[PDB]
């Protein structure tokens, strides 16, 4: 069990008696009066303790990746990497490492959608016996500025206008587009964002990444520059934004649903950590600077080599406890990896440890038992807010005759101290400035739009021609064209139509026509069908429940979630129309009998708002999603002027369907369904 | 203009070349480097200000009600209303005073939907020329609970099962239905927040309502139950939930913009002021009691008499500023209005002052610009975290000598002092109990469902 | 061992490598640098965790009380109680219940002197299998004011001027005596403050106070008044003010420096609980109302009864994890035990439980391992800043049907619950006032002064004299003075003659001759001299070392402990005279020989201030210790004009020397050597 150390703090209440905090058993549904109708006593020392706790329950969330959730598991290693790295949890063949991973979105507040469009976080730690390595990583491999000074500024954009802190969860607003337009580093990201990457079908369906360069180095202190990749087991796979909007009003919750669902059907998700490892002196060799986070290293010039993999098999018990109180830092780093004067991580360094003091309250937040190490704490520190142990050493300073040494000095020679790497140096004026190697913000973005499948572009170009459409000042969307403009004419051209505007001449500097792989996501079937989740529309009328719970029946041998929906809760359904909608599933399918809710009065019981079955298909099929029918239900698609002959779209006997039906789910998304410019 | 007073805080960047929190000139889009392609120093003070800031910037949410929004405006009283109430705001006929709204759902957190199904918000600061006078109240007249040690039970069911944090800004799930159906009390205000006040249209399309009986007191001393009600002017209007569900994915600031807009493009939306006034000796006539905030008094017991009039018509400047800390508590009374034994009331004049503590991690909250009073403070307290005044008496005590007796008590009779209701009394033995009179749990949902349209 | 529970929380770091906060091996003896003479790197991560936790060590001092220090123990108790209270803790004979205790002043600020003069704090927690109880009580029966919401006045008052934080730990300044004067309920613990209460010889010679009045219940309801009282096995004792002065400055750590040493020395102090037991329809019946905290209740009216003892034999571990954090609170209370109308001890169960949001800055403090119940947390509280838990009760609701209705419900019949005394009742109208019953302020402060010896009686009057003489304000000195009129016209002339004013004509309202017992410090010698502490002034030259030596050994049987002093440290010497001090000790002996550093070229010595031997003996004698010289060492008597036929002067043998010591260390001080009026 991968919670195991968890273990000593839990608390079971079950078949005790209420207590106070300070212990003492009690009753607590009562104020304490003055008479029957009385005021309450401020001597209610029961109440007090009560709400007052109550009144503290919230702290700060977090400054950016307020939504997220995350879960338990395990890495393990392949080989023994020791010829890479000093990296213990990398030290030895089938080695086992705990992990914990919040996945997160990044603009929005606690209580916003999973499915807004957005970055997304994935950050993985892991609980070494050379202590707390963090990789605190997105979704995405680039980020959209090249210093770390700039944070608040491309932060503060993004999120909502501080007059009237609108909008929530969404850069489709003036002040981000006026930023990504006027720091046009941004634009890779900014691309990524606006590509599937932005609106995922869940956590488990995303890769992860660094983004930096970091370092790994041995014993002997020999590096090698690294960028970390972990590359999904359940394939990558995305919505479209049409549908992740109706998901954001009908499931706010779908992300962290989806993953807690797969854990606790004991359908864990796996990721392989993976790395491109680069010599010191090819820092410069590819075309950009390797210290520049707002480029990738295409794979094609360093193919991945595999390390481990990592599980995720434990839910949290308490969600608070647990996900959010947990402290991610990328300064939780270990001996055998050294950092890069990447200058956006380089600030981080700063930013992570200075922003736990906020949202904890106090310098103690290590000893939180989701933050507490698993190979031991032994230093000179003491006191702060919340001090948790009692220290046994009282000559708590070094060098020191009295303590005979202890805790003593471990550097690379001695007690496996962490160690910078020997190798670096500085060379130059001190400087405010950035390295001119960084100056191009253009050709990764067209490598990236180029690497893209035909209706896959059609979907970034939709996603810009959106957001860009809510932008109120004209000055700045000629902005954002001009900039799109020295990365496609062609994407500008198609962008401006939207907006009504005339696209600049094309601008060719930056254009070029080079691919990579690795970077599409529709271009991929899915490896596996195992939980994704069928809606099985039926009736509680004549027959068709029977073949609705056949059909489920069949298709649960395939690791396939699901609900069979009917217009009450009759024995077999899992979900009435009221409550359903076609984005909690990946197929839907009507059962035969069912097409009679698709007209008429059948359409239109008090038990659900008006056409709700038609909606369900429709929606399904706008979106891209496998559709079918069985036997007679054939005329439910007929109804909504879908035809069998249709990719993804299936009609006849059940078996027929149920094949169909699976093989489409690995199709995943039927893109013969989107019009392309 | 409502927002005068705070014209004194605000800061102008126009022109001006960006500095450091302590002043002197920067720049500080690039950080200090050992080098062209080197590491970052420890010595570049100017990054750490910025991003030491930045990494602050957050603060708890509110532990209800955390996801809302506000406005200036001004109340104005329609009469010299000094024969109910001692109230300074309602002394005078024509008399103005500057108020704050903030609206609200109540389960989600700060970034949840306002289209979500829920009770609303409805909370109003009068600033007073005889101090902050608070009406904290939601769009429905009844609450879940009769006594405010339940508070928790109630808000911890409702929100989201602690195990995974699923469902956001939502009722529907087991912990809140099992808690509604075991707390039979909950079923009144249930049944409000699944009719149309559970997904008003817009903030403006809302009545309020303080929900508990209070006092009104004249300068003598005699009271009169009452129960405050605002009458939107533009009217009550809901949303289907199939559209509010919709709605909460395609723009969850549905709610927020539309009030803002509304006051942005000069319409101003209005309530009126209206009370129910009723007698010491008719707590109990109704047949329910008047201190159980799970009833309401039917208009035809006692009609809905209009006071005055509020109208907003001034956004935030900055809504962190502004709407993110300002601290409502229904403890903010002023001379002329009492509380009652309404044991839900009760125990929120407690958590409202307490919870400022964690929210402000601080006990100088009041003197924010958004929370100080119009009207003066003068008192004997000190320090504290961020002490941001400097006080002149350093006899910080009384009674004293030194100080000359300033500053100085004030009671009923002498410098319109805050009192108690005189005639006020308690009797019986101290129990944890609730009176028997609470007991009906079922008449007024019956009453509330009866009188809806068939649809 | 009463810390049995906290040793799962002790860190080892003996034979271990240096470490970050997150795990790792590091060394953080050196900054990284960008060259050998280069600026330091932001990415130097080691330098920032070490750094931020250095920088956010401290936490705001208790906003009174600051200054203190505390022990774990073990109270025991004498009896099945159940006749009396329900209280676990106090239900079977010899049923043992670890303790905590931490004493302090009132008015300094952390750091400030143990020996200034004020009241003092003695707080301890029961850790009873039926949760937390704590007795927050003082060395001093009564309190200054009557209602809670006097309390910052009172406070404000009291602690240093707002404009320039002077002065430092105590009341000698206007704003104090303005308050004093304008409040007159405050004059009662004001004459405990200004007798020996107010300068303690340390905290194992206090008694103790929960000063309100609470009740005690049986299972059955039935309800007692009580007052809690401790009794310390050590006797009272007090120093003398000017004493106390000059070792606030040579220790600040006295008292604090002589708990842990008499824990560590395996010379535990003990305090027997007491109770003073009386009927609900006493509460007006002896002249003043028990629900009035300015008063004490006379043990001619109702004896003390002991209950238990409590035992002090283990020091914290770490001073600030377990001392400093400590989070004391007199809504701490257990099924057996009520509250009562007392409107001080109302408003403290309010700001106790508040204040520890401001000291530990969230609402998570009980989870400290210092303030943990051992008999366990079991409710539906979740999250707040520092969630140390994690909860396994996902309907944290009640009532549920989900959680089968656990955590359950506990009452006076089910589930040994707290409850209220179930015959309480309220009757009147609302009201912002205080009963005329808490009218008289002057009688009792009268009846403790009556009690006193005349010296104690003097002290009282000297302190007094020596603290209104520093107030600049002539007004306030004559409100003082009108004031202590009421009390007794002899105290108010005796205080005037000091502020050089006419005392007021007797106003005999108040005044009467009555005493009561127990009051007193200096009427009774003390029942041991175990762990007092005795200064053998000797010298390095001659054979005056080996002889302190023996005196040391001899003294030393009967527990005392033993300083030999000398002007260097050679071998046998404890201490030099530059580094030793009148103040640090119970009894000043001159061994033979030492006469030579008294005067001659013996007392010249570079290795300590002129005068230095003869300062101390000089200050001794002065202080009221016993003082002796052996042998020809009386001549270190002679000169300083003191001679052997005085009480508490000891001359002669070692043998005889030693028998009178010991025999004046019982009585402590020589109250004949100090001036009384007249
Ligand atoms: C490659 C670029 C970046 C990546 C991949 C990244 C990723 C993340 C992730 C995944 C989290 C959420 C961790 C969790 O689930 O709790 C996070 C939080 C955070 N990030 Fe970043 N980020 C980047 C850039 C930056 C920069 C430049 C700054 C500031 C200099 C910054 C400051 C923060 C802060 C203050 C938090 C909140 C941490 C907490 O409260 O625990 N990030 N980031
Ligand atoms: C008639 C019953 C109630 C009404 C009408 C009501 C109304 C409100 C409103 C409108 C707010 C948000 C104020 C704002 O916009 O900032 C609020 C917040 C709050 N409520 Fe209540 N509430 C009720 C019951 C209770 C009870 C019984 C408790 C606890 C005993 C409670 C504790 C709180 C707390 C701690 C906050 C957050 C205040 C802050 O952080 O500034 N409420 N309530
Ligand atoms: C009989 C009257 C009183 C007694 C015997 C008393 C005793 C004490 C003691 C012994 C402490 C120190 C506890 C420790 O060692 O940590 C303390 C602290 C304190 N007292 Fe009192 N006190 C009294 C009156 C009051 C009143 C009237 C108030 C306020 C209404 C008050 C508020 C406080 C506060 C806020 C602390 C700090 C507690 C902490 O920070 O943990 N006290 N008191």
């Known amino acids: 069990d991968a919670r195991q150390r968890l273990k000593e703090v839990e608390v079971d209440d079950n078949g005790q008696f209420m207590t106070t905090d300070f212990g003492g058993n009690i009753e607590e549904q009562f104020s304490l009066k003055a008479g029957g109708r009385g005021s309450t006593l401020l001597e209610d020392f029961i109440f007090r303790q009560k709400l007052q706790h109550f009144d503290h329950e919230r702290i700060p969330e977090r400054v950016v990746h307020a939504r997220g959730a995350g879960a338990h598991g395990i890495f393990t290693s392949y080989g023994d990497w ?43 730690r892991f609980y070494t016996d050379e202590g707390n390595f963090d990789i605190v990583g997105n979704n995405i491999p680039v980020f959209f500025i090249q210093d770390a000074i700039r944070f608040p500024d491309l932060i503060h954009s993004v999120k909502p206008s501080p007059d009237n802190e609108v909008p929530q969860a969404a850069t ?8 990504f337009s006027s720091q046009p580093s941004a634009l890779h990201t900014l691309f990524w964002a606006m590509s599937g990457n932005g609106i995922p079908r869940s956590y488990r369906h995303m890769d992860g990444f660094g983004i930096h360069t970091f370092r790994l180095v041995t014993e002997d202190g020999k590096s090698k520059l690294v960028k970390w990749h972990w590359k999904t087991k359940q394939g990558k796979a995305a919505l479209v934004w049409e549908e992740a ?85 990328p300064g939780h780093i270990v001996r055998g990896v050294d950092f890069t004067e990447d200058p956006l991580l380089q600030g981080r360094l700063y930013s992570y440890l200075d922003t736990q003091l906020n949202r904890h309250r106090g310098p103690n937040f290590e000893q939180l038992p989701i933050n507490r190490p698993v190979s031991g704490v032994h230093n000179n520190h003491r006191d702060g807010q919340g001090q948790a142990w009692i220290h046994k050493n009282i000559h708590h300073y070094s060098p020191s005759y009295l303590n005979k040494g202890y805790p003593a000095q471990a550097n690379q020679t001695v007690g496996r101290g962490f160690f910078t790497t020997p190798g670096r140096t500085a060379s130059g004026v001190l400087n405010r400035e950035l390295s001119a190697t960084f100056d191009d913000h253009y050709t990764q973005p067209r490598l990236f739009f180029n690497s893209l499948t035909p209706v896959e572009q059609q979907f970034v170009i939709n996603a810009i021609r959106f957001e860009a459409s809510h932008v109120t000042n004209e000055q700045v969307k000629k902005n954002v064209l001009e900039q799109l403009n020295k990365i496609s004419n062609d994407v500008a051209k198609r962008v401006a139509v939207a907006l009504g505007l005339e696209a600049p001449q094309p601008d060719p500097t930056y254009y070029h026509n080079n691919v990579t792989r690795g970077v599409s996501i529709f271009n991929e079937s899915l490896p596996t069908i195992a939980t994704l989740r069928v809606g099985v529309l039926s009736t509680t009328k004549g027959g068709s429940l029977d073949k609705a719970k056949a059909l489920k029946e069949q298709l649960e041998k395939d690791g396939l979630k699901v609900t069979v929906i009917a217009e009450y809760l009759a024995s077999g359904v899992d979900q009435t129309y009221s409550a359903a909608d076609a984005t909690a599933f990946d197929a839907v399918v009507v059962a035969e009998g069912a097409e009679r809710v698709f007209s008429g009065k059948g359409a239109m019981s008090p038990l659900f708002p008006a056409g709700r079955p038609s909606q369900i298909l429709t929606d399904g099929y706008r979106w891209g999603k496998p559709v079918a029918a069985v036997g007679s239900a054939k005329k439910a698609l007929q109804s909504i002027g879908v035809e069998e002959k249709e990719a993804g779209v299936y009609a006849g006997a059940q078996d027929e369907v149920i094949k169909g039906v699976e093989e489409g789910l690995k199709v995943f998304k039927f893109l013969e369904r989107f019009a392309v410019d």
């Open 82 to 124: 020791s010829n890479i790295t000093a990296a213990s949890f990398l030290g030895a063949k089938d080695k086992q490492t705990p992990v914990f991973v919040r996945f997160s979105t990044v603009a929005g507040s606690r209580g916003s959608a999973d499915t807004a469009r957005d970055v997304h976080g994935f950050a993985t």
């Open 245 to 329: 909007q109706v998901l954001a009003g009908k499931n706010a919750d779908f992300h962290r649903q989806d993953l807690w669902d797969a854990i606790e059907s004991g359908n864990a998700p796996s990721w392989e950590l993976a790395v491109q490892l680069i010599d010191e002196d090819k820092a410069q060799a590819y075309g950009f600077d390797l210290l520049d986070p707002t480029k990738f290293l295409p794979e094609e010039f360093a193919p991945l080599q595999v390390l481990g993999e990592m599980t995720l098999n434990r839910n949290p018990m308490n969600y608070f406890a647990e996900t959010e109180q947990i402290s991610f830092q």
């Open 172 to 179: 489709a607003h003036d002040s981000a587009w006026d930023f």
